[PDB]
Amino acid sequence: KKVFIIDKQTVYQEIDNFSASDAWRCAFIGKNWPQEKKEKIADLLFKREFDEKGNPIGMALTNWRVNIGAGSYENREAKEVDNSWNRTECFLSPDGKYDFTKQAGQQWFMKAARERGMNNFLFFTNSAPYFMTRSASTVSTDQDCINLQNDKFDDFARFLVKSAQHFREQGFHVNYISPNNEPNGQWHANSFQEGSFATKADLYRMVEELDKAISEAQIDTKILIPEVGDMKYLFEIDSIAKTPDDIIHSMFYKDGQYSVLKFKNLFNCVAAHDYWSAYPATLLVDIRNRIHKELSANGHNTKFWASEYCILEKNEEITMPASPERSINLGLYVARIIHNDLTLANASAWQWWTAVSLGEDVPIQLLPLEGSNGLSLQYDGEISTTKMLWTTANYSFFVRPGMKRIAIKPTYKISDLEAATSLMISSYTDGKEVVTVAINYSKENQVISLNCDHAQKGKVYLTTIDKNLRYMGEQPLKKLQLPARSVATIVV
Incomplete structure (x- = not known):
């Protein structure tokens, strides 16, 4: 039996949110799916309530990432995105007129979120509007620099700011703008999707122009970069001048070549994705x-956000025919990413890629109605929750904006590395509740003692192969039973 002492006096990062993305699919669901199904998805994502038996109803996410379209849909007769799922409309047209009735399905999702008490939005782009680009398309045709014309950094920044301002004037708190996605990536090799490579010089200009545009608009919105596809680009990795690597030192130190710290409207936070770094445990x-x-060590109190992930990699832990065992393996694999982001990288936010998917790689899997194909999902389908939804919820439903991570140390020291294959546990508080989330990664049931001031009991919520964040009643803290292969949240 293991004993953990919670220390309210040792405080780490402030929690901003847990999030997911509306990209690609929500345009269809929000516009076409049956009302009751739409509403049900919205409840699983946003609604912070318990059902009749005391079980959390969903993730109750506290940010929502909205994909501002670049118009690969209007421009689709060009050499554009090659499929109908992944094309986007654009509010702005080449004549400079705005049509805010576009992106209707995604606007439905904004409205559904706010209705459920979640009014915190991030607007992100995968490309500048097709007509501003070098290739005349959201599909770029080189890796030289950003697929954006040299005199359109201001035009693009103005487009992003006007869109945010529009939605602010409709009552939506669009608090962040993320102008560039995975700028390390060789996007010109990919027509499945909108994208652009970009250099740190490109990124710096976008920050500079957005900063100016936000000040002119006087909107309460901040700029988030760089959304690198792999956390390795946060440090220097090659001898190629153009590579947007070395992000931390070059961009987020005061003497860095492309330091952005000076910009008033910068969100003081670095965003990177979890991809390719979640396995093996040493990495x-x-x-x-x-x-x-x-x-x-930047001397600036800069936050970190893990800002995109889904199951993309392959390995012995998660690569398997579909099964209830595969299902919980995926849930625990991702819960481990979450724990290490929060406790090692001290992340202030953890964010999914698309909330819904046809695969088993995010919170919600969409299943064609029987006998139907994948394209039929543009119109209607069946909602299936994954264990990834529930293991995220262990965190997201209970770890709320404004809470701070606090110390929880065992009596016997374990290494970061050893914890990763056995038992991971972290705590958070708002001064009224203390929330502890324990991952039992091992194949053995474990018993723990939770020492938390003078408290004797906590409510336990449990995700296993059999359980979707099931409420387990008030439990004595001195003897908390952690099933093998489980995530438990303990609320004091």
């Missing part, structure tokens, strides 16, 4: 420790 823990080491 998982080392790279995330490095983030916190380098970032916290």
Whole structure:
């Protein structure tokens, strides 16, 4: 039996949110799906309530990422995005007129979120509007620099700011704008999707122009970068001048070549994606420790956000025919990413890629109605929750904006690396509740003692192969039973 002491006096990062993305699919669901199904998805995502038996109803996410379209849909007769799922409309047209009735399905999702008490939005782009680009398309045709014309950084910044301002004037708190996605990526090799490579010089200009545009508009919105596809780009990795690597030192130190710290409207936070660094455990823990080491020595109190992930990689832990065992394996694999982001990288936010998917790689899997194909999902389908939804919820439903991570140390020291394959646990508080989330990654049931001031009991919520964040009643803290292969949230 293991004993953990919670220390309310040792405080780490402030929590901003847990999030997911509306990209690609929500345009269809919000516009076409049956009302009751739409509403049900919205409840699983946003609604912070318990059902009749005391079980959380969903993730109750506290940010929502909206994909501002670049118009690969209007421009589709060009050499554009090659499929109907992944094309986007654009509010702005080449004549400079705005049509805010577009992106209707996604606007439905904004409205549904707000209705459920979640009014915190981030607007993100995968490309500048097709007509502003070098290739005349959201599909770029080189890796030289950003697929955006040299005199259109201001036009693009103005487009992004006007869109945010429009939605603010409709009552939506669009608090962040993310102008560039995975700028390290060789996007010109990919027509499945909108995209652009970009250099740090490109990124710096976008920050500079957005900063100016936000000040002119006087909107309460901040700029988030760089959304690198792999956390390795946060440090220097090659000898190629153009590469947007070395993000932390070059962009988020005051003497960095492309330091953005001076910009008033910068969100003081670095965003990167979890991709390709979640396995093996040695890589998982080392790279995330490095983030916190380098970032916290910048003397600026800069936050970190893990801003995109889905199951993309393949490995022995998660690559398997579909099964209830595969299902919980995926849930625990991702819960481990979450824990290490929060505790090693000290992340202030953890964000999914698309909330819904046809695969088993995010919170909600969409199943064709029987006998139907994948394209039929543009119109109607069946909602299936994954264990990833529930293991995220262990965190997201209970770890609310404004809470701070606090210390929870065992009596016997474990290494970051050893914890990753056995038992991971972290705590958070708003001064009224203390929330502890324990991952039992091992194949053995474990018993723990939770020492938390003078408290004797907590409510337990449990996700296993059999359980979707099931409420387990008030439990004695001195003897908390952690099933093998489970995530438990303990609320004091």
